[PDB]
Design an enzyme around this catalytic site. Sequence first.
Site, short mmCIF file in Angstrom:
data_model
loop_
_atom_site.label_atom_id
_atom_site.label_comp_id
_atom_site.label_asym_id
_atom_site.label_seq_id
_atom_site.Cartn_x
_atom_site.Cartn_y
_atom_site.Cartn_z
N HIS A 56 0.82 -1.20 0.00
CA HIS A 56 0.00 0.00 0.00
C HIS A 56 0.86 1.25 0.00
O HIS A 56 1.39 1.64 1.04
CB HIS A 56 -0.90 0.00 1.23
CG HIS A 56 -1.90 1.10 1.25
ND1 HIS A 56 -3.26 0.87 1.32
CD2 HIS A 56 -1.75 2.45 1.20
CE1 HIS A 56 -3.90 2.03 1.32
NE2 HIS A 56 -3.00 3.00 1.25
N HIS A 58 1.20 5.36 -2.19
CA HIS A 58 0.63 6.32 -3.15
C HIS A 58 1.72 6.92 -4.01
O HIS A 58 2.19 8.03 -3.73
CB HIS A 58 -0.11 7.44 -2.41
CG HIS A 58 -1.34 6.98 -1.71
ND1 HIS A 58 -2.60 7.10 -2.27
CD2 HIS A 58 -1.52 6.37 -0.51
CE1 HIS A 58 -3.49 6.58 -1.45
NE2 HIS A 58 -2.86 6.14 -0.38
N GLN A 151 -9.79 9.23 -4.70
CA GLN A 151 -9.47 10.03 -3.51
C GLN A 151 -10.62 10.91 -3.03
O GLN A 151 -10.92 10.97 -1.83
CB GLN A 151 -8.24 10.90 -3.74
CG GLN A 151 -7.95 11.84 -2.59
CD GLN A 151 -7.43 11.09 -1.39
OE1 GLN A 151 -6.22 10.88 -1.27
NE2 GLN A 151 -8.33 10.67 -0.51
N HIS A 209 -9.72 1.89 0.89
CA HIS A 209 -9.41 2.70 2.08
C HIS A 209 -10.65 2.71 2.91
O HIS A 209 -11.61 3.41 2.59
CB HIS A 209 -9.10 4.14 1.72
CG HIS A 209 -7.75 4.34 1.14
ND1 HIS A 209 -7.35 3.74 -0.04
CD2 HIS A 209 -6.70 5.09 1.55
CE1 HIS A 209 -6.11 4.11 -0.32
NE2 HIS A 209 -5.70 4.92 0.63
N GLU A 212 -10.74 5.07 7.49
CA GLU A 212 -9.51 5.74 7.93
C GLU A 212 -9.87 7.03 8.64
O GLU A 212 -9.66 8.13 8.12
CB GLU A 212 -8.58 6.06 6.74
CG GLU A 212 -7.20 6.57 7.19
CD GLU A 212 -6.30 6.95 6.03
OE1 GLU A 212 -5.11 7.25 6.27
OE2 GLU A 212 -6.78 6.93 4.87
N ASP A 308 2.57 3.35 3.10
CA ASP A 308 1.53 4.32 2.68
C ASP A 308 2.05 5.54 1.90
O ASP A 308 1.66 5.77 0.75
CB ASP A 308 0.68 4.77 3.88
CG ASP A 308 -0.69 5.31 3.47
OD1 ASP A 308 -1.49 5.69 4.34
OD2 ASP A 308 -0.96 5.36 2.26
N1 1LD Z 1 -3.40 8.04 4.36
C1 1LD Z 1 -3.97 8.50 3.13
N2 1LD Z 1 -5.31 8.49 2.98
C2 1LD Z 1 -5.86 8.92 1.83
O1 1LD Z 1 -7.23 8.89 1.71
N3 1LD Z 1 -5.12 9.37 0.81
C3 1LD Z 1 -3.78 9.39 0.91
C4 1LD Z 1 -3.16 8.96 2.08
F1 1LD Z 1 -1.83 8.97 2.19
FE FE2 Z 2 -3.47 5.16 1.70
#
Ligand code: 1LD
Ligand code: FE2
Lengths: 413, 411
Positions: A56, A58, A151, A209, A212, A308
């Site tokens: 995981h 980005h 996103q 996701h 979170e 991450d």
């Molecule tokens: N921890 C994260 N959550 C997200 O929704 N986008 C990016 C990230 F790095």
């Molecule tokens: Fe993430």
Amino acid sequence: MKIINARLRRQEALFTLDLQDGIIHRITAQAAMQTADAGAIDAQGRLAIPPFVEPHIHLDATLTAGEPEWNRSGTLFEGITRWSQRKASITPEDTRQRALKTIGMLRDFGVQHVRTHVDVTDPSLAALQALLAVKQEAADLIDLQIVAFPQEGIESYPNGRELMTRAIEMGADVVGGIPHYENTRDKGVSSVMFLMDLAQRYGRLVDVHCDEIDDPQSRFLEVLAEEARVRGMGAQVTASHTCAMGSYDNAYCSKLFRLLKASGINFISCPTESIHLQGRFDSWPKRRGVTRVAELDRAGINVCFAQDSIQDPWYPLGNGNILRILDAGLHICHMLGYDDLQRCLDFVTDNSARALCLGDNYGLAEGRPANLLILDAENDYEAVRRQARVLTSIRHGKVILQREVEHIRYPAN
Amino acid sequence: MKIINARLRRQEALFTLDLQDGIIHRITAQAAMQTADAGAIDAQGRLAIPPFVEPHIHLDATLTAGEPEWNRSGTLFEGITRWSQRKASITPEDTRQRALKTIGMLRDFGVQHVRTHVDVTDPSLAALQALLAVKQEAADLIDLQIVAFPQEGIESYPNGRELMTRAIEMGADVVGGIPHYENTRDKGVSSVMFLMDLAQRYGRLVDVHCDEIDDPQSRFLEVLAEEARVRGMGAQVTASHTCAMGSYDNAYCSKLFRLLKASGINFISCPTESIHLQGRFDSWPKRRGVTRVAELDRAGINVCFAQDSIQDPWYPLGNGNILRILDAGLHICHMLGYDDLQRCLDFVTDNSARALCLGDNYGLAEGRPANLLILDAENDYEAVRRQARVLTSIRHGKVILQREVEHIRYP
Ligand SMILES: Nc1nc(=O)[nH]cc1F
Ligand SMILES: [Fe+2]
Ligand SMILES: Nc1nc(=O)[nH]cc1F
Ligand SMILES: [Fe+2]
């Protein structure tokens, strides 16, 4: 190629590994230490493992921390705002250059399998285009999976369902999602239904996701797990983060675990990211904000750790080293018991490989691809305690990285 | 000995450091990346810093993890039980051999200043005797300070007061304490009064394990700080841990901060240890259990980070690297802001030196001891980000450690 005097995980005996034609030809227990004939690598009693996995990350956002502004609050939400701003200037070549540089960091630390999320809430899909090409270009170093990650929401962003669809049709391997971020609870639910339908229709993996956020009412995990269970897709589905589980009512959570086990889904936790981003809305006491990793693992549920972010709108540090993340995770999740530490490498190798459905393309067994590392340590405990260096990385039977064993001089004696 | 092309903290300029007779003779700003002459060490744009400090570690317990039994719960209280068992077979030679090996680890990671707590709830005072000796023996690597630490309590252990007094008479530099572990609140309070009287009478420093527990009623910090303030000994006093502060009522804590500021005391936080030992009595959500480090620093109060334990009855890991501790503390305490990262080495160098009252025996300034490191990084940010290695350690003007710069080959 021959590797002698190698340790294998949780065994005492030394092994010789014979590599031929890009696959592992033979693995055989030795009597004792031996001498490397010409063209033989002597592992010198060091551990040989399959490569580290980064399940995981980005990559579209990597190396953009501070552009055009910093995330001052250190929160998930401000990070999204900052990324939204940076997106205004994302180009395919910009994405490519940053991603390749970060891939170089991962390579330096023994990572050969990467799953990247790519933001598809961008009508140009510029970053996706770039990363689909990077997947090909960087294949000499890594096997990259790409997640179509909305996103800014599926239901909540203009043409979100269409953008997710375009991204899957362009060949993203994995369908993502962000149900806790949709504008209303009902849209969070329908986003899960859509993404699972989309994954099922196109035969893709799923990695969402999921929750979170520190809100104990964020319970989209139950929706994901039940769709996985009903559709018979459990092994194909991963829930990333699940931070809210770290704050769930305990009676609910105990019930929930029955479904989590029954669904067969995987879990990814990002402890360095969550320790930084969670707990921001507490005063004191301040919650850790991490999912129940030790508990999932004890229930027989597959869970693993990930970095991450590397120097991005959400997280200002990062150097590609998964062992630092393992260390943080064992601490924060209260997994520093003797038994935890004897097998702790599971959480950054085998478990992660299972989440990515690598199957027989991963692992040290005869007939499988010759991809492996030699670590500067004898066992799992020493690996994490010393943050052992990757001395050798081998990919498709070829050495792609070589480090010298550190040597410290004491000139004053 | 001359070092050229060195970066100094929080500046872009390059510097030459001239060391003679064990001291820093001259610090000179350069106008370029210079060609090195035959004798000189070329830092090549790397950061020169004064040595890392380890202001809180238990050398008497180091490398005893699992002897005779493991701490199964991972709690402070089971740790004390296991240590009580191990203490049954502690001897001076046993203590010396383990302490030297861990001192070797600390040296390997650029640590030249160390404050060790020694358990004096032991009528033979075995470990204290060993460590008083190690203080002299290992002086070629480190400046060691010793804290008389009554692990099993002062008021709560047979002859506790007399053992603390004997330990101070024998030459311990620092008076310790553990008020939250005394059997009643009233005895916690009396232990602080006693230990402050003891320190003040013999002219010693103070460093108390203070409120290492998630109980929001654990408030011995206020007594400690008030005694420091009234006696005018703030600078000499340190409160270690203060985990309970991370659970305090916020109105109380705001009030308390006025006293903390006025008292002038120091704080030490052990983030890896506390993330491990604290929060064990919560279910979910689970608290961090670390003191309010960022808040203390913003209020102008001196706070720093420490390893606490290396492979001992409380903590199974450890390798002597303070930069990993810095990493943990910045994450857990929410100090990953851009401003924080630009100065984050404060928390393992300058601030720690202040807690140990090192004064002019520490820091890169002319006239001071030639004790310094060259790190494989240009600034604080890169140092913590890459967990930069210590390439050179210099003590009293001599190179005592040299590492090659890492070079990865790509075939
Ligand atoms: N921890 C994260 N959550 C997200 O929704 N986008 C990016 C990230 F790095
Ligand atoms: Fe993430
Ligand atoms: N964290 C600790 N607390 C104690 O009271 N003793 C030893 C330790 F390591
Ligand atoms: Fe301690």
